[PDB]
Coordinates of C-alpha atoms and ligand atoms in Angstrom, one line a residue:
Chain A
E1 CA 118.0 -248.3 -114.9
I2 CA 115.2 -249.0 -112.4
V3 CA 115.7 -249.3 -108.6
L4 CA 113.6 -251.9 -106.7
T5 CA 113.1 -251.1 -103.0
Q6 CA 112.0 -253.9 -100.8
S7 CA 110.3 -253.4 -97.4
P8 CA 110.8 -254.4 -94.7
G9 CA 114.5 -255.4 -94.4
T10 CA 113.6 -258.2 -91.9
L11 CA 110.4 -259.9 -91.0
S12 CA 110.1 -262.1 -87.9
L13 CA 106.8 -264.1 -87.7
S14 CA 105.5 -267.2 -85.9
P15 CA 104.3 -270.2 -87.9
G16 CA 100.8 -269.8 -89.3
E17 CA 100.9 -266.0 -89.4
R18 CA 100.8 -264.3 -92.8
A19 CA 103.8 -262.6 -94.3
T20 CA 103.4 -259.6 -96.6
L21 CA 106.4 -258.5 -98.6
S22 CA 106.6 -255.3 -100.7
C23 CA 108.6 -254.2 -103.8
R24 CA 108.5 -250.7 -105.0
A25 CA 110.0 -249.7 -108.4
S26 CA 111.5 -246.3 -109.1
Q27 CA 109.5 -246.3 -112.3
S28 CA 106.7 -248.3 -113.8
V29 CA 107.4 -251.9 -114.9
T30 CA 106.2 -252.7 -118.4
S31 CA 103.5 -255.3 -118.6
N32 CA 103.9 -256.0 -114.8
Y33 CA 107.1 -258.1 -115.5
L34 CA 107.8 -258.7 -111.8
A35 CA 109.0 -261.9 -110.2
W36 CA 109.6 -263.2 -106.7
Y37 CA 112.4 -265.6 -105.8
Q38 CA 113.1 -267.5 -102.6
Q39 CA 116.7 -268.2 -101.7
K40 CA 117.9 -270.3 -98.7
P41 CA 121.6 -270.2 -97.7
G42 CA 124.0 -272.1 -99.8
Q43 CA 121.3 -272.8 -102.5
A44 CA 120.3 -271.2 -105.7
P45 CA 117.2 -268.9 -106.0
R46 CA 113.8 -270.7 -106.4
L47 CA 111.4 -268.8 -108.6
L48 CA 108.1 -268.4 -106.8
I49 CA 106.1 -265.9 -108.9
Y50 CA 106.6 -264.1 -112.2
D51 CA 104.4 -261.8 -114.3
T52 CA 103.3 -260.3 -110.9
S53 CA 101.0 -263.1 -110.0
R54 CA 101.5 -266.4 -112.0
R55 CA 102.8 -269.1 -109.6
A56 CA 105.7 -271.1 -110.9
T57 CA 105.2 -274.8 -111.5
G58 CA 105.1 -276.7 -108.2
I59 CA 104.9 -273.8 -105.8
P60 CA 102.4 -274.0 -102.9
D61 CA 99.1 -272.0 -103.1
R62 CA 100.0 -269.9 -100.1
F63 CA 102.6 -268.0 -102.3
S64 CA 100.5 -265.4 -104.1
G65 CA 101.7 -262.2 -105.9
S66 CA 99.8 -258.9 -106.3
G67 CA 100.5 -255.4 -107.5
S68 CA 100.8 -253.3 -110.6
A69 CA 102.9 -250.4 -112.0
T70 CA 105.2 -249.5 -109.1
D71 CA 103.8 -251.4 -106.1
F72 CA 104.0 -255.2 -106.0
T73 CA 103.3 -257.5 -103.1
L74 CA 104.2 -261.1 -102.1
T75 CA 101.9 -262.8 -99.6
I76 CA 102.6 -266.0 -97.7
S77 CA 99.3 -266.9 -96.1
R78 CA 100.4 -269.9 -94.0
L79 CA 104.0 -270.0 -92.7
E80 CA 105.9 -273.2 -92.1
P81 CA 109.3 -273.1 -90.4
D82 CA 110.9 -274.1 -93.8
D83 CA 110.2 -270.5 -94.9
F84 CA 113.3 -269.0 -93.2
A85 CA 114.9 -267.5 -96.3
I86 CA 115.5 -264.3 -98.2
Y87 CA 112.9 -263.2 -100.8
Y88 CA 113.9 -261.1 -103.8
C89 CA 111.8 -259.2 -106.3
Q90 CA 113.0 -258.8 -109.9
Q91 CA 111.7 -256.7 -112.8
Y92 CA 112.2 -257.5 -116.5
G93 CA 110.3 -254.7 -118.3
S94 CA 113.0 -252.1 -118.9
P95 CA 118.5 -254.0 -117.9
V96 CA 116.9 -256.4 -115.5
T97 CA 117.2 -255.5 -111.8
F98 CA 116.8 -257.2 -108.4
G99 CA 115.8 -255.9 -105.0
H100 CA 118.1 -256.4 -102.1
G101 CA 115.6 -258.8 -100.5
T102 CA 113.5 -259.3 -97.4
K103 CA 114.8 -261.6 -94.7
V104 CA 112.1 -263.8 -93.1
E105 CA 112.9 -265.2 -89.7
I106 CA 110.6 -267.8 -88.1
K107 CA 109.6 -266.9 -84.6
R108 CA 109.5 -269.3 -81.7
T109 CA 109.6 -269.5 -77.9
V110 CA 112.6 -268.1 -76.1
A111 CA 115.4 -270.6 -75.7
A112 CA 118.6 -270.2 -73.7
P113 CA 121.9 -271.3 -75.1
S114 CA 124.2 -274.0 -73.6
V115 CA 127.7 -272.5 -73.5
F116 CA 130.9 -274.3 -74.1
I117 CA 134.5 -273.0 -74.2
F118 CA 137.4 -274.6 -76.0
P119 CA 141.0 -273.8 -75.0
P120 CA 143.6 -273.7 -77.9
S121 CA 145.0 -277.0 -79.0
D122 CA 148.7 -277.6 -78.5
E123 CA 149.2 -278.3 -82.2
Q124 CA 148.1 -274.7 -82.6
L125 CA 150.4 -273.2 -79.9
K126 CA 153.3 -274.8 -81.8
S127 CA 151.9 -272.8 -84.7
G128 CA 152.5 -269.6 -82.7
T129 CA 148.8 -268.5 -82.5
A130 CA 146.2 -269.2 -79.8
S131 CA 142.5 -269.5 -80.8
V132 CA 139.9 -269.6 -78.0
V133 CA 136.4 -270.7 -79.1
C134 CA 133.1 -270.2 -77.4
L135 CA 130.0 -272.1 -78.5
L136 CA 126.4 -271.1 -77.9
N137 CA 124.3 -274.1 -79.0
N138 CA 120.7 -273.8 -80.2
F139 CA 119.0 -270.6 -78.7
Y140 CA 116.5 -268.1 -79.7
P141 CA 116.3 -265.2 -80.5
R142 CA 119.5 -264.5 -82.5
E143 CA 120.3 -261.5 -80.3
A144 CA 123.0 -262.5 -77.8
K145 CA 126.0 -260.8 -76.1
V146 CA 129.3 -262.7 -75.9
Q147 CA 132.3 -261.2 -74.2
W148 CA 135.8 -262.4 -73.5
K149 CA 137.7 -261.7 -70.3
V150 CA 141.3 -262.6 -69.9
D151 CA 142.5 -262.5 -66.3
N152 CA 139.2 -260.7 -65.7
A153 CA 140.0 -258.0 -68.3
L154 CA 137.3 -257.4 -70.9
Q155 CA 138.7 -257.9 -74.4
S156 CA 138.2 -255.7 -77.5
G157 CA 138.8 -256.1 -81.2
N158 CA 140.3 -259.6 -81.0
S159 CA 137.0 -261.6 -81.5
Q160 CA 135.0 -262.7 -84.5
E161 CA 131.5 -264.2 -84.3
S162 CA 129.8 -266.7 -86.7
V163 CA 126.2 -267.8 -86.7
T164 CA 124.3 -270.7 -88.2
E165 CA 121.1 -270.3 -90.1
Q166 CA 117.8 -271.0 -88.3
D167 CA 117.6 -274.8 -87.6
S168 CA 115.0 -276.5 -89.8
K169 CA 113.7 -278.7 -86.9
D170 CA 113.5 -276.3 -83.9
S171 CA 114.3 -273.0 -85.6
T172 CA 117.2 -272.1 -83.2
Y173 CA 120.5 -270.5 -83.8
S174 CA 124.0 -271.6 -82.8
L175 CA 126.8 -269.2 -82.4
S176 CA 130.6 -269.3 -82.6
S177 CA 133.0 -266.7 -81.2
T178 CA 136.7 -267.2 -81.7
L179 CA 139.2 -265.1 -79.6
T180 CA 142.5 -265.0 -81.3
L181 CA 145.8 -264.4 -79.4
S182 CA 149.5 -264.8 -79.7
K183 CA 151.3 -267.7 -78.1
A184 CA 152.9 -264.9 -75.9
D185 CA 149.9 -263.0 -74.6
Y186 CA 148.2 -266.4 -74.2
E187 CA 150.8 -267.8 -71.9
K188 CA 151.2 -264.5 -69.9
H189 CA 147.7 -264.9 -68.6
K190 CA 145.8 -267.7 -66.7
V191 CA 142.0 -267.3 -66.6
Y192 CA 140.1 -267.2 -69.9
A193 CA 136.4 -266.7 -69.5
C194 CA 133.5 -266.4 -72.0
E195 CA 130.5 -264.4 -70.7
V196 CA 127.1 -264.9 -72.5
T197 CA 124.1 -262.8 -71.9
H198 CA 120.8 -263.7 -73.6
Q199 CA 117.1 -263.0 -73.3
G200 CA 116.3 -266.4 -72.0
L201 CA 118.9 -266.1 -69.2
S202 CA 118.1 -264.8 -65.7
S203 CA 121.6 -263.4 -65.6
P204 CA 124.8 -263.7 -67.7
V205 CA 126.4 -267.2 -67.9
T206 CA 130.2 -267.5 -67.7
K207 CA 132.3 -270.5 -68.9
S208 CA 136.0 -270.4 -68.2
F209 CA 139.2 -272.4 -67.8
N210 CA 142.7 -271.9 -66.2
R211 CA 145.6 -272.6 -68.5
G212 CA 146.5 -275.5 -66.2
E213 CA 143.6 -278.0 -66.0
Chain B
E1 CA 115.2 -284.0 -115.1
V2 CA 116.0 -280.5 -116.3
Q3 CA 119.6 -279.9 -115.3
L4 CA 122.1 -277.0 -115.6
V5 CA 125.7 -277.5 -114.4
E6 CA 128.3 -274.8 -114.4
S7 CA 132.1 -275.3 -114.5
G8 CA 135.3 -273.3 -114.8
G9 CA 135.3 -271.3 -111.6
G10 CA 138.2 -270.8 -109.3
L11 CA 140.9 -268.3 -108.2
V12 CA 142.2 -265.8 -110.8
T13 CA 144.5 -262.8 -110.3
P14 CA 143.2 -259.3 -111.1
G15 CA 143.4 -258.5 -114.8
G16 CA 143.4 -262.2 -115.6
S17 CA 140.9 -264.2 -117.7
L18 CA 138.6 -267.2 -117.0
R19 CA 136.2 -269.2 -119.2
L20 CA 133.0 -270.4 -117.6
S21 CA 131.0 -273.3 -119.1
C22 CA 127.4 -274.5 -118.4
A23 CA 126.0 -277.8 -119.8
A24 CA 122.3 -278.2 -119.9
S25 CA 119.9 -281.1 -120.3
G26 CA 116.2 -282.0 -120.1
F27 CA 114.7 -279.5 -122.6
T28 CA 114.9 -278.4 -126.2
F29 CA 118.0 -276.3 -125.7
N30 CA 117.9 -274.6 -129.1
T31 CA 114.6 -272.9 -128.4
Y32 CA 115.7 -271.1 -125.2
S33 CA 117.6 -268.0 -124.3
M34 CA 120.4 -269.0 -121.9
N35 CA 121.4 -266.6 -119.2
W36 CA 124.3 -265.9 -116.8
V37 CA 123.6 -264.4 -113.4
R38 CA 126.0 -263.8 -110.5
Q39 CA 125.9 -263.2 -106.8
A40 CA 128.8 -261.7 -104.9
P41 CA 129.5 -263.2 -101.4
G42 CA 127.0 -261.7 -98.9
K43 CA 125.2 -259.6 -101.5
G44 CA 122.3 -260.0 -103.8
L45 CA 121.8 -261.0 -107.5
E46 CA 123.1 -259.2 -110.6
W47 CA 122.3 -260.3 -114.1
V48 CA 125.5 -260.6 -116.2
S49 CA 124.6 -261.6 -119.8
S50 CA 122.1 -263.4 -121.9
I51 CA 121.9 -264.8 -125.4
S52 CA 119.0 -265.8 -127.7
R53 CA 118.4 -269.3 -129.0
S54 CA 120.4 -268.8 -132.2
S55 CA 123.0 -266.2 -131.0
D56 CA 121.2 -263.4 -133.0
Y57 CA 120.8 -261.2 -130.0
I58 CA 123.5 -260.8 -127.3
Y59 CA 123.1 -258.7 -124.2
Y60 CA 125.5 -257.6 -121.4
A61 CA 125.2 -255.6 -118.3
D62 CA 127.1 -252.3 -118.4
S63 CA 129.3 -253.6 -115.5
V64 CA 130.8 -256.3 -117.8
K65 CA 130.4 -254.8 -121.4
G66 CA 133.6 -254.9 -123.4
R67 CA 135.1 -257.4 -120.9
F68 CA 132.9 -260.5 -120.9
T69 CA 131.8 -262.4 -124.0
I70 CA 128.9 -264.9 -124.1
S71 CA 128.4 -267.7 -126.6
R72 CA 126.6 -271.0 -127.0
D73 CA 126.8 -274.2 -129.0
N74 CA 123.4 -275.8 -129.7
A75 CA 125.1 -279.0 -130.8
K76 CA 126.6 -279.5 -127.2
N77 CA 123.8 -277.9 -125.2
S78 CA 126.3 -275.5 -123.7
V79 CA 126.7 -271.8 -123.0
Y80 CA 130.0 -270.1 -122.3
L81 CA 131.3 -266.9 -120.7
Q82 CA 134.8 -265.7 -121.6
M83 CA 135.7 -263.3 -118.8
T84 CA 138.6 -260.9 -119.3
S85 CA 140.1 -258.0 -117.3
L86 CA 138.8 -259.4 -114.1
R87 CA 138.2 -257.0 -111.1
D88 CA 137.5 -257.6 -107.4
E89 CA 133.8 -256.7 -108.0
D90 CA 133.6 -259.7 -110.3
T91 CA 134.2 -262.0 -107.3
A92 CA 130.9 -263.8 -107.3
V93 CA 129.1 -267.1 -107.6
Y94 CA 128.1 -267.3 -111.3
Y95 CA 124.8 -269.0 -112.2
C96 CA 123.6 -270.4 -115.5
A97 CA 119.9 -270.0 -115.8
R98 CA 116.9 -270.7 -118.1
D99 CA 113.6 -268.9 -118.4
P100 CA 110.3 -270.6 -117.5
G101 CA 109.5 -271.2 -121.2
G102 CA 107.4 -269.4 -123.7
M103 CA 108.8 -266.0 -122.7
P104 CA 108.4 -263.0 -125.0
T105 CA 112.1 -261.8 -125.1
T106 CA 115.6 -262.9 -124.5
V107 CA 116.1 -261.5 -121.0
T108 CA 113.3 -262.2 -118.5
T109 CA 113.1 -264.4 -115.4
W110 CA 114.7 -267.7 -114.6
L111 CA 112.9 -270.9 -113.4
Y112 CA 115.9 -273.3 -113.6
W113 CA 119.3 -272.5 -112.1
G114 CA 122.5 -274.4 -111.9
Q115 CA 124.4 -275.1 -108.7
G116 CA 126.6 -272.1 -109.5
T117 CA 130.4 -271.9 -109.8
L118 CA 132.5 -269.5 -107.7
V119 CA 135.1 -267.1 -109.2
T120 CA 137.5 -265.5 -106.8
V121 CA 139.4 -262.5 -108.1
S122 CA 142.4 -262.1 -105.8
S123 CA 146.2 -262.1 -106.1
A124 CA 146.4 -264.0 -102.8
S125 CA 147.7 -267.5 -103.3
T126 CA 145.6 -270.7 -102.8
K127 CA 146.4 -272.0 -99.3
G128 CA 145.2 -275.2 -97.7
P129 CA 143.8 -275.1 -94.2
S130 CA 145.2 -275.9 -90.8
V131 CA 142.8 -278.2 -88.9
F132 CA 143.1 -278.1 -85.1
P133 CA 140.8 -280.1 -82.7
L134 CA 138.3 -278.6 -80.3
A135 CA 138.7 -281.2 -77.5
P136 CA 135.6 -282.0 -75.5
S137 CA 135.5 -280.7 -71.9
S138 CA 134.2 -282.4 -68.8
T139 CA 128.8 -280.6 -69.2
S140 CA 125.5 -278.7 -69.4
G141 CA 122.5 -281.0 -68.8
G142 CA 124.7 -283.9 -69.6
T143 CA 125.8 -282.4 -72.9
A144 CA 129.3 -282.2 -74.2
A145 CA 130.7 -280.3 -77.2
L146 CA 133.6 -280.9 -79.5
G147 CA 134.7 -279.9 -83.0
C148 CA 137.4 -279.0 -85.5
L149 CA 138.9 -275.6 -86.0
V150 CA 139.7 -275.0 -89.7
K151 CA 142.2 -272.1 -89.6
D152 CA 143.7 -270.0 -92.3
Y153 CA 142.8 -271.0 -95.9
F154 CA 142.2 -269.3 -99.2
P155 CA 140.1 -269.2 -101.3
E156 CA 136.6 -270.4 -100.4
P157 CA 135.2 -273.0 -99.9
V158 CA 135.9 -275.8 -97.5
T159 CA 133.4 -278.6 -96.6
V160 CA 133.3 -280.3 -93.2
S161 CA 131.7 -283.6 -92.3
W162 CA 131.8 -286.0 -89.4
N163 CA 132.5 -289.7 -89.7
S164 CA 132.3 -289.2 -93.4
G165 CA 128.6 -288.4 -93.6
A166 CA 127.4 -290.8 -90.8
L167 CA 127.2 -288.2 -88.0
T168 CA 124.7 -285.5 -88.8
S169 CA 122.7 -284.8 -85.6
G170 CA 123.9 -282.1 -83.3
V171 CA 126.4 -280.8 -85.8
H172 CA 126.5 -277.0 -86.2
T173 CA 129.0 -276.0 -89.0
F174 CA 129.6 -272.3 -89.2
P175 CA 130.0 -269.8 -92.1
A176 CA 133.6 -268.9 -92.8
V177 CA 135.0 -265.7 -91.4
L178 CA 137.5 -263.4 -93.0
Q179 CA 140.5 -262.7 -90.8
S180 CA 142.6 -259.6 -91.1
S181 CA 145.1 -262.2 -92.5
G182 CA 143.1 -262.2 -95.6
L183 CA 142.6 -265.9 -95.0
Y184 CA 139.4 -267.7 -94.1
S185 CA 138.6 -269.7 -91.0
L186 CA 135.7 -271.7 -89.6
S187 CA 134.7 -274.1 -86.8
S188 CA 132.5 -277.2 -87.1
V189 CA 131.1 -278.4 -83.7
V190 CA 129.0 -281.3 -82.4
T191 CA 127.0 -281.5 -79.3
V192 CA 126.8 -285.0 -77.7
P193 CA 125.8 -286.7 -74.5
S194 CA 128.9 -286.9 -72.3
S195 CA 128.8 -290.7 -71.9
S196 CA 129.1 -291.3 -75.6
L197 CA 132.6 -289.9 -75.6
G198 CA 133.7 -293.5 -74.7
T199 CA 131.2 -295.3 -77.0
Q200 CA 132.0 -293.5 -80.3
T201 CA 134.9 -292.0 -82.1
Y202 CA 134.5 -288.6 -83.7
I203 CA 136.5 -287.9 -86.9
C204 CA 136.0 -284.6 -88.8
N205 CA 136.6 -284.8 -92.5
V206 CA 137.7 -281.4 -93.9
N207 CA 137.9 -280.9 -97.7
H208 CA 139.6 -277.9 -99.5
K209 CA 139.4 -278.7 -103.2
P210 CA 140.9 -275.3 -104.1
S211 CA 144.1 -276.9 -102.9
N212 CA 143.3 -280.7 -103.1
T213 CA 143.4 -280.8 -99.3
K214 CA 141.7 -283.6 -97.5
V215 CA 142.0 -283.7 -93.7
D216 CA 140.6 -286.3 -91.3
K217 CA 141.2 -285.1 -87.7
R218 CA 140.2 -287.4 -84.8
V219 CA 138.9 -285.5 -81.8
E220 CA 139.5 -287.0 -78.4
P221 CA 139.3 -285.7 -74.8
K222 CA 142.4 -283.8 -73.7
Ligands
LIG1 O1 111.8 -272.4 -134.0 P1 110.5 -271.5 -134.2 O2 109.3 -272.1 -133.6 O3 110.9 -270.1 -133.6 C1 112.1 -269.4 -134.0 C2 112.2 -268.1 -133.2 O4 113.1 -267.2 -133.9 C3 110.8 -267.4 -133.2 O5 110.2 -267.7 -132.0 C4 110.9 -265.8 -133.4 O6 110.1 -265.5 -134.5 C5 110.4 -265.1 -132.1 O7 111.2 -265.3 -131.0 C6 111.2 -264.3 -130.0 O8 112.0 -263.2 -130.4 C7 113.4 -263.6 -130.3 C8 113.9 -264.0 -131.7 O9 115.2 -264.5 -131.5 C9 113.4 -264.8 -129.3 O10 114.3 -264.5 -128.3 P2 115.0 -265.8 -127.8 O11 115.6 -266.6 -128.9 O12 116.0 -265.4 -126.7 O13 113.9 -266.6 -127.0 C10 113.4 -266.1 -125.7 C11 112.3 -267.1 -125.3 O14 111.2 -267.0 -126.2 C12 112.8 -268.5 -125.2 O15 113.9 -268.5 -124.4 C13 111.8 -269.5 -124.7 O16 111.4 -269.2 -123.3 C14 110.5 -269.7 -125.5 O17 109.8 -270.9 -125.1 C15 110.3 -272.1 -125.8 O18 109.9 -272.1 -127.1 C16 108.6 -272.8 -127.2 C17 107.6 -272.0 -128.0 O19 107.3 -270.7 -127.4 C18 108.2 -273.1 -125.8 O20 107.4 -274.2 -125.7 P3 106.6 -274.4 -124.4 O21 105.7 -275.6 -124.5 O22 105.8 -273.2 -124.0 O23 107.7 -274.8 -123.3 C19 107.3 -275.1 -121.9 C20 108.5 -275.7 -121.2 O24 108.2 -276.1 -119.9 C21 109.1 -276.9 -122.0 O25 109.0 -276.6 -123.4 C22 110.5 -277.3 -121.6 O26 110.5 -277.7 -120.3 C23 111.1 -278.3 -122.6 O27 111.2 -277.8 -123.9 C24 109.6 -273.3 -125.2 O28 110.2 -274.5 -125.5 C25 112.0 -264.8 -128.8 O29 111.8 -264.0 -127.7 O30 110.4 -271.2 -135.8 C26 109.2 -270.6 -136.1 C27 109.1 -269.1 -136.0 O31 110.2 -268.5 -136.5 C28 107.8 -268.9 -136.8 O32 106.7 -269.3 -136.0 O33 107.9 -269.8 -137.9 C29 108.9 -270.8 -137.6 C30 108.4 -272.2 -138.0 O34 109.3 -273.2 -137.7
LIG2 ZN1 121.7 -253.5 -106.1

């Protein structure tokens, strides 16, 4: 078996800049049987290059492949925002093997999130569980800090975050953070706050509600 | 229109068996090696099995040898994968794939892919979701938010839409999250101008085919 190491793990670039992706094999790949795929979330892989450098049918000219033996390259000369994806290399000279891919973020100007907080429904408190949701709509970069405070006590372990992919239009992210509680601990408290701290924020934003509103 | 369509995925208990099918169109099927490739959730791609145009040469990855069997029928433009003795590692989206044409050997690279079918290996039971509403508040820059909380369901996936496809702008639907329950959950939210809370109704349509669940929750101000 051959191992394919891709570098870097992530690549964040502005539109127009040139991306350079690398794939290094643990051995030599016979006849330079190396391919490059593009995969966007929820979709199947789209073959870009194969045989090191032959562009697949219908692929823009900016996608070019280089390399030989153990060092192969994928170059993306111009960058459109529709290039936020993961890019895999694959050899077929040996079993066939894939790399783990190189994520490609599209860079843009700093954008602060608008924050919303959702108290649990009352259908759901009948269920016996309380879910408190905090939304962070369309911001950049992805790096953001969300924290729950219940009666002004910082919470730990009872939160799960979920993030959208980069928007195709404006290349932003939107984030969900769900704080899960029992019906009991939920009603033994009053003030539920969600505190967001982000790069495009002068200082942390806090959205909250009192259980009687 | 070159097309590959997989079928036969779903939830199966560990040790169980499942048969995958992939129908193909738009090319001379009997002159092509057909290939199966899988992708576990969150991970990369892993080639599973391939078969030459006349079944003379059959190839398996060591991860599935002795357990998976591949076969085709050039009279139905179809390739098959009999999976047996299924493990948790076999939980993946299984792709049926075709090489770019004129390739020198059976296993190469793959220009055409199917939509993929998802095989969940788990003894957990299929469970429909619980759809709770995220009622709109009462405003950042004149913007309001609202959505549906899709709580506790297994296995993947669920689809969510708003006003059965009509509302698309401002929607941000999130990847599912694995609770310690072992069940999945997700939210789907919409950002709207505050005033249009009176001039439009917002109905979220949740769909869980793994349990034939169809939910239409109407979201109103609380
Ligand atoms: O019917 P033929 O013409 O050939 C029979 C084959 O057994 C033969 O190729 C064999 O010797 C070598 O295969 C190789 O060795 C393994 C023997 O089993 C094969 O493995 P596999 O069986 O696993 O084959 C792997 C790979 O070669 C194929 O999947 C495929 O990509 C090829 O392209 C196809 O074949 C055309 C010839 O190379 C190509 O035409 P091509 O125009 O290049 O296709 C482009 C493509 O875009 C479009 O065709 C498609 O969109 C619509 O069709 C493709 O159609 C091959 O690797 O019969 C031939 C042949 O036996 C000999 O020439 O005399 C016979 C006269 O009729
Ligand atoms: Zn690997």
